[PDB]
Amino acid sequence: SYYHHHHHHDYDIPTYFQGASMPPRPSSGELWGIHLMPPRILVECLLPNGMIVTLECLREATLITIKHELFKEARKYPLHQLLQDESSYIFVSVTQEAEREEFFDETRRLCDLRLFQPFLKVIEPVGNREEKILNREIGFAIGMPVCEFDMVKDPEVQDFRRNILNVCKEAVDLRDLNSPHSRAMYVYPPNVESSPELPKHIYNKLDKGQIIVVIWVIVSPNNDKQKYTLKINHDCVPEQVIAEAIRKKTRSMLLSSEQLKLCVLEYQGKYILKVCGCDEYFLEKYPLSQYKYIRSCIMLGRMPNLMLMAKESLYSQLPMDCFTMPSYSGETSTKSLWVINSALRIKILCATYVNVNIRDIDKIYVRTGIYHGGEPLCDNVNTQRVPCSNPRWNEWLNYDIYIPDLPRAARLCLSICSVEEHCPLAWGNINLFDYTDTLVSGKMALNLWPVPHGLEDLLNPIGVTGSNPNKETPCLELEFDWFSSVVKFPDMSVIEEHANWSVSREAGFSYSHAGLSNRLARDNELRENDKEQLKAISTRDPLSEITEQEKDFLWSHRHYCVTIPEILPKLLLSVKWNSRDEVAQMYCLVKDWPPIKPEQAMELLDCNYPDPMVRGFAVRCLEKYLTDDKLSQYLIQLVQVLKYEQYLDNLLVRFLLKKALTNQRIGHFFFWHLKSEMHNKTVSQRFGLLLESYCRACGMYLKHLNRQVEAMEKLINLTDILKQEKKDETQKVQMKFLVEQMRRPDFMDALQGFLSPLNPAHQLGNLRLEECRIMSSAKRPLWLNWENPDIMSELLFQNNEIIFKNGDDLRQDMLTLQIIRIMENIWQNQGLDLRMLPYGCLSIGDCVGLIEVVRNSHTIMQIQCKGGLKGALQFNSHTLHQWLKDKNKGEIYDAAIDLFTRSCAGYCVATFILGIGDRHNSNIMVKDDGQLFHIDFGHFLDHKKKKFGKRERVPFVLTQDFLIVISKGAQECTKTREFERFQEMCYKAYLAIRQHANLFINLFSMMLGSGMPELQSFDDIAYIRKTLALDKTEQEALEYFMKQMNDAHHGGWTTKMD
Amino acid sequence: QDWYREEVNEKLRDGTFLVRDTKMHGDYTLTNKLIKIKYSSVVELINHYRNESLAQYNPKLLYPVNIEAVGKKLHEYNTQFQEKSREYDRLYEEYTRTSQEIQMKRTAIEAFNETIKIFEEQCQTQERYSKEYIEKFKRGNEKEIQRIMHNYDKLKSRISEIIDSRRRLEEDLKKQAAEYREIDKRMNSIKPDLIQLRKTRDQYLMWLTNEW
């Protein structure tokens, strides 16, 4: 009656679809195919005399210990007198990366060697430079051996490795320029806002520009400290602050005034300012306000705590970086591209590995096309030959574009398709010119890539240039027309001359033309209706596509466009890249175009601007305008944008690499963002090669990065065992296993002396195992807690705790928190105080990461479970508000509500615009002090509209709970002024972002590289157009926002002067 | 009223054209390439360029593409589509992790091989130095050599195991490689129907113009 007695006969009750909750695994641990080696283990010790003594020794034994015992237990075997003293020997074995690694560091533990099979050959030290065979350190940091590169055939690779050192050498120069200062300046760059100005809402906190600061000192033995509370000008510098501390410290009844002045001067510059509780340092002329620690204190109602640290104790710590060149320290007479008189043609041959059902699929072909982002000719196919069963062509596809009209950045994109039954099988793209400027000619083998999740379209030009390094995949080879000579792309002198010729030739073209459009006839003197359709176009966002009229219109008035530098991105998308006439002329405008702002210039490194000249310009912008503060904000995007760079060596890489080697805070996140994506074999080579350069030249931080790396691998194994072998055990049982393991010496070693990768300022000391635990989630995330071993920990935080989560893919969270952070700074630097809490997140691997724990904060759900009465009948709307009053009693109350209402406002607007996952009581959080913030954001640009979805959703819907709180205690509170005030924040917040909507488009645009399913192509990013409403006028948008906020809430939003 | 951005581009997804509607900007638009639009009419100008090409204006438009009884078919086509999408989402997982697992084997096979060579070299290494001490001295004798025999006997029957172990891996590579192909095989079958199941679901919701 329930089911019409319909039997489902297939349904097997045992097995299971991962429903009956943890995603991608696994990577192996301490020995081959076993996560965690047995505590006592048998190891075959191969000696120089050919004997195999099999030792038994513990999992955690050092090689000093294994050697020392092996040369005691080898005596008892035969041929003892054909062995030297043990000190004449070193261990060696085959690792899981399959390479013969020599074991120089004898303090290393047997479990920590990644050994594959449990054995150890004995040898005498070959290749006498021991020093140089600390490329171990580099390949450990990288997660592949350096020798794997030394055996790469490709000349580009080997050219990259040699030529990139140019940069490294220059960078190491800058570091030891005015040492030891410049070294400290590298290691401890000043953590500083890019604007010395102060928003009015901060200034107002200071009583006419004055902060109370507290300077701390230590005397004897190295124990007791002393405060020296100053009150100084916000805008005074560290050198002034150090003086005023010293004055106060050394005033006396025995020193006159004049005598004080002298004892200060001899002391003044012997010291520098530290921040208490972490390794941040105020090391150059900046307003104290402009340092971020200071500006945070001012907003948080706190009194700075600095320390007077002696330059010689700080320079004591900074060791030498002492850079060493590694062992690794075009063609003659050619024919120009422009000489060649033929159309392009390409011979397609023989796909071999094609896995298709001959039942289901009818017939299959190879689509092809030439590309520049978007394409310079008609797209064409071959005929549907030897369909399915052993696919074989020997055609010549003929492309209607002459060979001299191929732009420098041109690329062939191809794909194998099936049959309006059209359906792509495999894909792959080649650069038509190589990295040495050479037009490609001859036969090429190209192993193809699988179509991605979202990719319904059939060819894939945005996808990466190059062949799949995985051999066992559809390898379709092909032939490129060869013109008796290695063809090359012309010099710049040549391309200038063609342009100067092509412009003189334009002046003599006469009168009318049919579709004259693309040239003026208007003269140097241009109409005023023309000049105000141009600046009108200039304003429009990246995604508002241009019509062919507007293109030709722009392209005609191209020379006036030098008036409006900011128009360049549009201008370039109007050029016909299939007309070398046009393109040559463009190269000369772009040559000496006025530099633009970095936020404008980052568009020009997205996938739609492949030209080298263009991208070079954009880098020249960044070189001039983009600051170390603003760089390290956008670094994620600048690393993602590398993937669209045709060749290994380029300007973008050389820039980033240099900044990384020049400022250790960038370097740090530069490492992790590259390292993060080493599993993804599109980028493994490129990023590996880059990480090698960085690691080779960054000096002592490498050793620090190795410790972080060594710590994460331990944790990755730990969570892997918990998620596989120790599932279906009680938390109780799991947590024993956790403690038991962390106790062992190798873990104790590996997890104690290091720097948080979420922020390397924080040192992580001994871990407090009392407070470490496996959280309740199914992904088995680890709650980890460390002592803050800083001298004055107590002044900042005694304990430092962060979450390590093996399951989820952190990089969507990572990106949304970046976008929030940016909205905060946009708002706040317009005097508009909306307090977002973009908590820390870092992807370090394939679905592995780190999340900053915010202490004293609670999921609304907890609030309500805590304040819920027993006889569990229904929860109260007020419970939230009750809990919050309970925290904030007195004048304190009114300020807590302000915060809530300010943060609730930002997170409303932010969340609506970004389209993030629907909000509810277990992903909204409130702090004791009354700030609200979201977590576990989910898919951002509305990825569950790929199912059924113009929904234009509202994810943060303000239940009664919040509204009560927003308006003190009122009943039916939609009508209080408290809430009017609120709505006004929401309206001025919505608009403030809308005026910066370009950047947000561009930040999302630059991320298309990353294999994030939520960002497959531009229409994804086009959600953010509707929700910011850029087709509308701002007053229409305000109403659109009001309207959307009204309909989700059911009543509130229809009273303001827009 | 009765062919006439974001949802326009989704209807250009996969000659084909249509006409679109700031008013202080232009009026209508012909969408893929965009053409801004006497216009004597909107329907006048387009009929002329359906038969003919767009070359002569600027250096064809060939493809102008039950109120209660279609409603539940929106739930039905959606519930296979969303089943079918899951099947596609599962297999692309299996495909890739099987690709991963495969290459971990390939790398292990290399590691095995290098392991073996060090051992081959070891049994080679003992012969040079042991058969020096068999011919020097002689009259040690069996208290020496039958222990140097014992060591060696282990040295090779270990190598036996290591090559056994490698083979046993190599066979699994094949079975894994087989399964890898089979997954891809079915991926490519499910894909084209997934598009048709999706394309009709768009058409069914577009004719009507949500428990479903």
Ligand SMILES: Nc1ccccc1CO
């Ligand atoms: N014109 C263009 C360029 C890049 C991406 C998408 C489009 C429109 O489909």
